[PDB]
Amino acid sequence: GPGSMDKATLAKYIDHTLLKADATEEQIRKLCSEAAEYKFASVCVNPTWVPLCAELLKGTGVKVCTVIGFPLGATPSEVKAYETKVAVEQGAEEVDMVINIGMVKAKKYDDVEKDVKAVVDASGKALTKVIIECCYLTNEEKVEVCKRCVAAGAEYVKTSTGFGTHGATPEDVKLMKDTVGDKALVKAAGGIRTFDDAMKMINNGASRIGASAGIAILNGIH
Amino acid sequence: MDKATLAKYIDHTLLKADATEEQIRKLCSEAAEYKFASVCVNPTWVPLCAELLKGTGVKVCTVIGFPLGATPSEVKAYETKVAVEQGAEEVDMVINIGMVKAKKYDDVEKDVKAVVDASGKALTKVIIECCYLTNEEKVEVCKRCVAAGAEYVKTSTGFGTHGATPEDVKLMKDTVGDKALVKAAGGIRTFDDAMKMINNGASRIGASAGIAILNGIH
Amino acid sequence: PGSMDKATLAKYIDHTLLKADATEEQIRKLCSEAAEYKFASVCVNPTWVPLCAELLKGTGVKVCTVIGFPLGATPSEVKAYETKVAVEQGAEEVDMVINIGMVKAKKYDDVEKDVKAVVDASGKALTKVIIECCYLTNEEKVEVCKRCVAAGAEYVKTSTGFGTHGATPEDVKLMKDTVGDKALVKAAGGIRTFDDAMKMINNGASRIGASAGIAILNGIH
Amino acid sequence: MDKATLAKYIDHTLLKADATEEQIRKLCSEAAEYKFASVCVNPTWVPLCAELLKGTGVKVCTVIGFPLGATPSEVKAYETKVAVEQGAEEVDMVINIGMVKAKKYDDVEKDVKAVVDASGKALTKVIIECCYLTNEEKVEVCKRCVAAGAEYVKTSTGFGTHGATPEDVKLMKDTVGDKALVKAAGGIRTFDDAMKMINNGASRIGASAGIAILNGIH
Numbered sequence: 001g002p003g004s005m006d007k008a009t010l011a012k013y014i015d016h017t018l019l020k021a022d023a024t025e026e027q028i029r030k031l032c033s034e035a036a037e038y039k040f041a042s043v044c045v046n047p048t049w050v051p052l053c054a055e056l057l058k059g060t061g062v063k064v065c066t067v068i069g070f071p072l073g074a075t076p077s078e079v080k081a082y083e084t085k086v087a088v089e090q091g092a093e094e095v096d097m098v099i100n101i102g103m104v105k106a107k108k109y110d111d112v113e114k115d116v117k118a119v120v121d122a123s124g125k126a127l128t129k130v131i132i133e134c135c136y137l138t139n140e141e142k143v144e145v146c147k148r149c150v151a152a153g154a155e156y157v158k159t160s161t162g163f164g165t166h167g168a169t170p171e172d173v174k175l176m177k178d179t180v181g182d183k184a185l186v187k188a189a190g191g192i193r194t195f196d197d198a199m200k201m202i203n204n205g206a207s208r209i210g211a212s213a214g215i216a217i218l219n220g221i222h
Numbered sequence: 223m224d225k226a227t228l229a230k231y232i233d234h235t236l237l238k239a240d241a242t243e244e245q246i247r248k249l250c251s252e253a254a255e256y257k258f259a260s261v262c263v264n265p266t267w268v269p270l271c272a273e274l275l276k277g278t279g280v281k282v283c284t285v286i287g288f289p290l291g292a293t294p295s296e297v298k299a300y301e302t303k304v305a306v307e308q309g310a311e312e313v314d315m316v317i318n319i320g321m322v323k324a325k326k327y328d329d330v331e332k333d334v335k336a337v338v339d340a341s342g343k344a345l346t347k348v349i350i351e352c353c354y355l356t357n358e359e360k361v362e363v364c365k366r367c368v369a370a371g372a373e374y375v376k377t378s379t380g381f382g383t384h385g386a387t388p389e390d391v392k393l394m395k396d397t398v399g400d401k402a403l404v405k406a407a408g409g410i411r412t413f414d415d416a417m418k419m420i421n422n423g424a425s426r427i428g429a430s431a432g433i434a435i436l437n438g439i440h
Numbered sequence: 441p442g443s444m445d446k447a448t449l450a451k452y453i454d455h456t457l458l459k460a461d462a463t464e465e466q467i468r469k470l471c472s473e474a475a476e477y478k479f480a481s482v483c484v485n486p487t488w489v490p491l492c493a494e495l496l497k498g499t500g501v502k503v504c505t506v507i508g509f510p511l512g513a514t515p516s517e518v519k520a521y522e523t524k525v526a527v528e529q530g531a532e533e534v535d536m537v538i539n540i541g542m543v544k545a546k547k548y549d550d551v552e553k554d555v556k557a558v559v560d561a562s563g564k565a566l567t568k569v570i571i572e573c574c575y576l577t578n579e580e581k582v583e584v585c586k587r588c589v590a591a592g593a594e595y596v597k598t599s600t601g602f603g604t605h606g607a608t609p610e611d612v613k614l615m616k617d618t619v620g621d622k623a624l625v626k627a628a629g630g631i632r633t634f635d636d637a638m639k640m641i642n643n644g645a646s647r648i649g650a651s652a653g654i655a656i657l658n659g660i661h
Numbered sequence: 662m663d664k665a666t667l668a669k670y671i672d673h674t675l676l677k678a679d680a681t682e683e684q685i686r687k688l689c690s691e692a693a694e695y696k697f698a699s700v701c702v703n704p705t706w707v708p709l710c711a712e713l714l715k716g717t718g719v720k721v722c723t724v725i726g727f728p729l730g731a732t733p734s735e736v737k738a739y740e741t742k743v744a745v746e747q748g749a750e751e752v753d754m755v756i757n758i759g760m761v762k763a764k765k766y767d768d769v770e771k772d773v774k775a776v777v778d779a780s781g782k783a784l785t786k787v788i789i790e791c792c793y794l795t796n797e798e799k800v801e802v803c804k805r806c807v808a809a810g811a812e813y814v815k816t817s818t819g820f821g822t823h824g825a826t827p828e829d830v831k832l833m834k835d836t837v838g839d840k841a842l843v844k845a846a847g848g849i850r851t852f853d854d855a856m857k858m859i860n861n862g863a864s865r866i867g868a869s870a871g872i873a874i875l876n877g878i879h
């Protein structure tokens with residue numbers, strides 16, 4: 001049988017992340033080196049660092065993931081689409097966009113779907129994840145946003161940016177996964193620091209984990 | 223300092239990710255009533271604010287590559303082009319801090335120049351995000367902003383570890399002299415806060431507490 | 441299950457008032473609140489120690505005060521005397537500020553001596569050392585924390601709340617990674633919400649300095 | 662009014678918590694070059710400044726219970742005793758504002774007298790921190806400073822919400838008459854700012870901008 005969670009298996013959940021505004025070339029290179037050694041699913045970096053990461057990770061099995069309209073989501077759809085086009089051109093294999101929360105609060109859900117669809121269209125062969133930023137949403141809004149992401153064709157819905165008031169909760173992961181079922185996957189991100197934290201998210205339906213602490217998580221397996 | 227004069231220093235700001243249309247409408251209403259210099263809003267709200275503020279003397283200001291600054295120059299440029307097309311009269315861009323930390327200051331200048339070019343008739347302010355910079359970095363970034371043709375250098379996004387300090391404003395103003403103007407932003411809550419910035423060289427104040435600032439004159 | 445509740449969270453909080461123009465009435469209110477909500481401590485300037493010690497007799501709430509605060513730029517013997525007087529007057533914890541000039545000169549044996557002077561003066565009172573992260577490099581934060589453990593301080597503390605900024609979750613984690621279980625970490629300054637507080641606690645903080653403790657308790661979610 | 666005369670109004674000040682040995686050496690070098698009245702530094706730097714300023718005619722001034730004033734009188738007195746032993750020639754203490762707000766003015770007076778007695782040959786200045794006081798409180802505190810034997814009353818720490826105002830300087834001088842002198846500090850940036858405070862009764866000026874103040878004479 002598959003037995004207990006192990007290093008090889010858990011590593012493939014991890015998007016090894018560095019998104020601080022003042023991140024340096026040296027830190028980005030170290031992130032890539034770490035991800036290649038630990039065989040993480042991806043690195044997740046801001047769009048400026050995409051082509052460097054793509055070069056460094058060619059052949060390693062580690063994907064380049066980036067963030068779109070991040071972390072506020074408060075820019076026009078055409079701008080999110082353009083940033084997506086450029087990121088994929090430059091080597092991004094996954095893009096994680098932030099929703100327009102103003103549209104959600106206005107109940108303009110057809111516009112939310114169109115905003116996601118603009119990024120989905122621009123992504124091409126790259127996978128699209130949509131950050132719904134749970135900390136600012138009601139449960140009704142979480143559910144309806146997830147439905148619109150599936151309708152727009154996004155492969156993933158994602159809990160949080162890590163920059164808001166709070167990040168992933170197991171309850172949110174479960175609500176999101178119950179909403180999308182097998183039609184989309186769930187990424188839990190923000191405040192995930194330990195092996196036990198990661199497992200709680202995975203046990204509630206997460207197929208991917210966004211973290212800066214991937215090393216600590218992988219090395220805490222027992 | 224009287225209220226009308228102080229009001230024209232103020233960029234009445236709402237940049238929260240979860241800001242609502244109702245809040246943006248109130249922001250515009252307040253700016254027009256109190257005759258603030260501008261509203262400062264995320265790019266999604268430019269069309270609405272441009273329509274609401276037509277004829278009021280209040281400018282529409284938006285933020286570019288914000289708040290992290292960590293996206294290609296061409297993306298900052300495109301966002302700027304769209305914003306100006308949609309009615310933005312000022313654009314406040316965030317620098318690529320990675321370039322600064324690499325000491326690639328020619329690259330920092332080109333990144334600014336990309337947004338300056340795209341701004342057209344709109345004024346460009348450059349957010350240098352002082353809280354993450356050394357003093358040497360603040361000075362050199364400011365010099366590159368002038369070289370690139372930006373009208374303003376700006377202390378902060380309001381999303382970093384801290385915002386405007388009077389010492390940062392003075393350093394920035396000493397560097398640019400009369401070749402550019404300085405905007406202080408982030409954490410400015412009172413009249414006394416605003417005046418510390420103005421007296422150290424700020425020509426503009428970014429705040430949410432504008433009404434309280436006007437009413438706190440003493 | 442295992443989520444934070446109000447009784448547990450309250451014991452992280454040092455209910456703080458340090459403004460130069462704080463009033464007797466405000467200090468009395470601070471004590472009354474801390475007693476009612478069973479906060480860990482009140483944190484007040486040394487002048488208010490005897491009043492707080494009297495008010496909090498029989499409550500479980502500790503009297504914490506601040507030493508060489510907020511600038512840290514006075515001789516060790518003066519920090520030590522202020523500590524002695526504070527403890528004599530009823531202080532149960534003292535929170536000193538480091539001499540930052542020593543750190544910038546890379547005179548870390550002198551930083552250790554400065555902390556040890558306060559630790560020696562503290563007697564029965566616990567010592568916390570404010571390192572004022574906003575003014576320090578990461579290398580400096582690490583070395584200062586090491587010297588605090590060497591001197592025998594029970595706590596290292598992020599910030600005064602009077603500098604350019606206060607506690608960051610990254611600073612809390614760096615400090616805790618440095619001291620391990622040899623010392624505890626207090627996060628202070630700019631902590632306004634339950635979410636702010638939890639970011640600090642989840643990164644290693646055993647105590648939270650704040651003025652908004654009632655709202656923090658009310659904000660659990 | 663000329664440069665040498667104005668220079669002797671100025672206490673050349675650096676009190677930031679993160680001030681460095683290099684910066685304090687530069688402060689002393691500048692004060693000796695421009696012949697300012699004093700340097701004003703935190704108590705930790707008194708021995709170095711005393712050594713550096715020997716024979717220059719510049720006094721070493723330091724601050725006591727600063728900037729909050731919220732520590733017992735015996736502690737302010739001990740800090741004062743150490744400072745003077747270490748070479749301080751002037752000490753600038755901060756009042757206990759909680760005492761003022763409780764109208765415990767005999768206790769305010771005792772607090773000042775503790776530092777006065779401890780100062781010995783060094784002159785004592787008392788920072789009343791006007792920004793936190795009512796006008797009635799400023800007047801009463803100034804009377805108590807005279808009663809306790811302080812040579813100076815001083816407007817501000819420069820760390821509070823606002824610094825010297827001409828109206829406060831005037832009120833303070835009107836209260837003390839010729840029985841004490843007034844020092845204006847906080848926010849004094851230019852020649853005309855300094856002259857305005859002097860016009861209102863200031864005999865001393867606390868500032869970091871002394872060189873610019875002298876160079877702005879007109």
Ligand code: NA
Nearest residue numbers: 123124125126
């Ligand atoms: Na795609």
Ligand code: NA
Nearest residue numbers: 341342343344
């Ligand atoms: Na332009």
Ligand code: NA
Nearest residue numbers: 562563564565
């Ligand atoms: Na002790």
Ligand code: NA
Nearest residue numbers: 780781782783
């Ligand atoms: Na004397």
Ligand SMILES: [Zn+2]
Nearest residue numbers: 044065066096
């Ligand atoms: Zn990503």
Ligand SMILES: [Zn+2]
Nearest residue numbers: 135165166635
């Ligand atoms: Zn929350």
Ligand SMILES: [Zn+2]
Nearest residue numbers: 195196220222
């Ligand atoms: Zn476990």
Ligand SMILES: [Zn+2]
Nearest residue numbers: 262283284314
């Ligand atoms: Zn703006």
Ligand SMILES: [Zn+2]
Nearest residue numbers: 483504505535
């Ligand atoms: Zn304390």
Ligand SMILES: [Zn+2]
Nearest residue numbers: 701722723753
């Ligand atoms: Zn002095």
Ligand SMILES: [Zn+2]
Nearest residue numbers: 414792822823
């Ligand atoms: Zn004021």
Ligand SMILES: [Zn+2]
Nearest residue numbers: 852853878879
């Ligand atoms: Zn003039």
